[PDB]
Design a protein around this nucleic acid. Sequence first.
DNA 1: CGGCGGTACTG
DNA 2: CAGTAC
DNA 3: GCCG
Length: 327
Amino acid sequence: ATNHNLHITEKLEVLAKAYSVQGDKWRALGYAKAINALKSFHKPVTSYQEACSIPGIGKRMAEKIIEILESGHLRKLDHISESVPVLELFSNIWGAGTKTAQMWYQQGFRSLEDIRSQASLTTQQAIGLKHYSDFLERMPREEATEIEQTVQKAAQAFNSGLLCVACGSYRRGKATCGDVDVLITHPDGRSHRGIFSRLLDSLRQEGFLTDDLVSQEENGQQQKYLGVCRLPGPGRRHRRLDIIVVPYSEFACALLYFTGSAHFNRSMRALAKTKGMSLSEHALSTAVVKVGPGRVLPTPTEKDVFRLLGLPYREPAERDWLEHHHH
DNA sequence: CGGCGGTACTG
DNA sequence: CAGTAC
DNA sequence: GCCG
Ligand SMILES: Nc1ccn([C@@H]2CS[C@H](COP(=O)(O)OP(=O)(O)OP(=O)(O)O)O2)c(=O)n1
Ligand SMILES: [Ca+2]
Ligand SMILES: [Ca+2]
Ligand SMILES: [Ca+2]
Ligand SMILES: [Ca+2]
Ligand SMILES: [Ca+2]
Ligand SMILES: [Ca+2]
Ligand SMILES: [Ca+2]
């Protein structure tokens, strides 16, 4: 775009973070939409009226946008609770969300050392905690490619016809990635089955996977792996890796889901529901509603899902937000 | 005013 | 079930 | 927070 309201969005984002770490998620959702709407606007907002006219912006947000626009900052930023930056710190641990972070706060911890030395930690959070720094860093797009190639090469050693694709921010074209998302399927509709057993064992053998966060290996029909990998060679960081294995008939919906963004996926699914459909990572489904399951519409490609939702195909680089348009 | 995406693990 | 995650 |  070119954010024409940069000075405004900066400040609303601080505020938004604050609700977000305090656990006030709907409020934080509201801020995020407004903020995207400001960023995409053709010009600096100049009037309260013009602010309210924007979908995503109502009275309370227009008051703020205006106050910032005239007076040059936002009072409310100097009343944010002091606990917020601790709650953010604790929430940046993988596996600890706002509840854990609040529990730790009421136990009086205020730093990661208070966490290590005294807090009770789930298995996941202990892993989250020891890799705190590495997991906060975004990786270059090129390290993501090598991670994906590792997973793919290990998969094709078992079956050369297996399809592997990196999704997430990578597929949306970004320069850096918070974590790598790999989608595996097989066009024969069948040989995706039992992959995780073999694939995980192989990736552990040569030391690439260093920890597992979610991986239900008791289940032969396991569909997801969330864990931690590390490319070989000196000084490499530990990275988050997510792998999903799906049947080929689910490929377009899984691809769409895994490409995201999160906000994009939410809006798509909200749209589907407005049309008596249901959109998931597994399928797009018609005639919903206790509720009734409705039937799967076949969707051999992502274009089919867009078409059935009455939208034009959206290129992966333009899937940051649904309500963001224009070539 | 109530709804705000739909689903998969963990414990 | 609540919590966290994708 | 905003929307229907
Ligand atoms: N709450 C969520 C989270 C993710 N998603 C979907 C499924 S996984 C895909 C990408 O999500 P990630 O959290 O890896 O974000 P991105 O890849 O966009 O960015 P970075 O990893 O931060 O580079 O989005 C979702 O539908 N709902
Ligand atoms: Ca509006
Ligand atoms: Ca966390
Ligand atoms: Ca590939
Ligand atoms: Ca991810
Ligand atoms: Ca990602
Ligand atoms: Ca396990
Ligand atoms: Ca309310």
